[PDB]
Amino acid sequence: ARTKQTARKST
Amino acid sequence: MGIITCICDLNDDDGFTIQCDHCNRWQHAICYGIKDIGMAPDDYLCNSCDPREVDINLARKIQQERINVK
Ligand code: NA
Ligand code: NA
Ligand SMILES: [Zn+2]
Ligand SMILES: [Zn+2]
């Protein structure tokens, strides 16, 4: 399927 | 249009959404039990376009908790 995923990384 | 319309009725971005093949509105993957991209099938329809067995109360619980602790 079509997806959106946001990754949050500190350094 | 980038509209989120999900079974939790808490339609803000939770960071992992999936787009209905038919109506093109977006759902939270976790509300549909899709924990990562690997759990997403080739073909996908939302609950409005194709009623399915899905735990609506659990979906609301998870999203409301995310909102309550942000
Ligand atoms: Na909704
Ligand atoms: Na999600
Ligand atoms: Zn949801
Ligand atoms: Zn749909």
Side-chain angles (χ1 to χ4, degrees), chain B residues 5-6 9 11:
Chain B
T5 299
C6 195
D9 289 332
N11 295 311

Side-chain angles (χ1 to χ4, degrees), chain B residues 34-59:
Chain B
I34 298 167
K35 300 188 298 175
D36 55 35
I37 293 173
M39 293 192 71
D42 280 7
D43 305 311
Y44 165 83
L45 297 171
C46 78
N47 195 52
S48 290
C49 292
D50 183 36
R52 65 163 76 190
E53 179 177 73
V54 64
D55 192 333
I56 291 178
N57 293 320
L58 175 61

Side-chain angles (χ1 to χ4, degrees), chain B residues 2-70:
Chain B
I3 307 298
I4 297 175
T5 299
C6 195
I7 55 176
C8 55
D9 289 332
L10 294 164
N11 295 311
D12 67 310
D13 187 10
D14 76 338
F16 180 24
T17 51
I18 184 169
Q19 191 181 26
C20 178
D21 284 338
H22 184 63
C23 71
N24 296 313
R25 296 183 177 224
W26 296 78
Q27 295 72 56
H28 308 116
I30 195 65
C31 286
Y32 280 71
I34 298 167
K35 300 188 298 175
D36 55 35
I37 293 173
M39 293 192 71
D42 280 7
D43 305 311
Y44 165 83
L45 297 171
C46 78
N47 195 52
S48 290
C49 292
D50 183 36
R52 65 163 76 190
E53 179 177 73
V54 64
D55 192 333
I56 291 178
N57 293 320
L58 175 61
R60 194 173 69 84
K61 176 190 192 68
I62 293 171
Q63 295 299 337
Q64 186 65 249
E65 170 78 16
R66 168 183 60 82
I67 294 167
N68 285 343
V69 301
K70 171 169 176 212

